[PDB]
């Protein structure tokens, strides 16, 4: 409760008055494969903040220029989903967690 960052503002959000538990454990030898597991994505930016226990689910190409990009992400037209690159040789703090 009462947190800020990528995950707390553009993803899963907890109310201030939380009445439960949080459980996390490392799963390096379960999710990190050679070459990078490109199966876990996180929203990079968003116009505003999510409501508590409310989740945006869809995506659109945000146009931040003057020309109407036709559904193609290039310059001044961004796709708001970046993926993790979990590899077994990374260090703690960048390894997958559940």
């Amino acid at each position, epitope marked *: 409760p009462g947190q800020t*960052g*990528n995950i707390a*503002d553009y993803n899963y959000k907890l109310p201030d008055d939380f009445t439960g538990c949080v459980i996390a454990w490392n799963s390096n030898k379960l999710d990190s494969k050679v070459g990078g597991n490109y199966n876990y994505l996180y929203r*990079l*930016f*968003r*116009k505003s903040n999510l409501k508590p226990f409310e989740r945006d689910i869809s995506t659109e190409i*945000y146009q*931040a*220029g*003057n020309k109407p990009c036709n559904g193609v992400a*290039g*310059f*001044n037209c*961004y796709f708001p989903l970046r993926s993790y*690159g979990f590899r077994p040789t*990374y*260090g703690v703090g*960048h390894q997958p967690y559940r």
Partner: antibody
Amino acid sequence: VQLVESGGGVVQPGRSLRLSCAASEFTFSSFAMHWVRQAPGKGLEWVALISYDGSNKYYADSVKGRFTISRDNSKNTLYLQMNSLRAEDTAVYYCARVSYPLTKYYYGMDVWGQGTTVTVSS
Amino acid sequence: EIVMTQSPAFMSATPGDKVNISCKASQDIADDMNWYQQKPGEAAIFIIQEATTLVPGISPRFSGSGYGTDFTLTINNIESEDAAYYFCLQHDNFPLTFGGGTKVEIKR
């Protein structure tokens, strides 16, 4: 996409100056802005950072307490105010744009400017 | 304050050969650096993002590699317009710090 800045010039030590950076062909209000500088014969040095709304302002230790960063979204302008200038402030100043929009936790830069010269001499 | 060391400071480029530029960090940063090129008289150009991705619009001759502490920018098939000022920037934690700088010149 273009960034144009001006307002530099020669000024006596201890006085004040204001630099203005102008943006065009892109949404100025959705991006964060960087002020950087490079002294003659030396590498570049980061100076200041401002968010896309103006709530968060970050300064460097050497220029803390003397430089003020601000923005005007209606006029698409970025302002830097310099007070109590000393001999170490003679450099070339650059105005930079953050790569991603509507983000308060990314700091990469992709678009720069040509620069302006500020000379602190009497 | 992460100190970034860039080498070499000055290099001579024989056309057709390859160039490696080394950027090193005192601390550990993971894919949190960019490579920029600036020719004299104009603005800088965004060349390499996060040490691996090549920015669209740039020639595929440039490449980058490295993770953790050491990073290498590699240029192949040097041509006469590759003479510029290259620098490596880290954007991990405040304050942001740049590299030293490398000047490449053609050889005759």
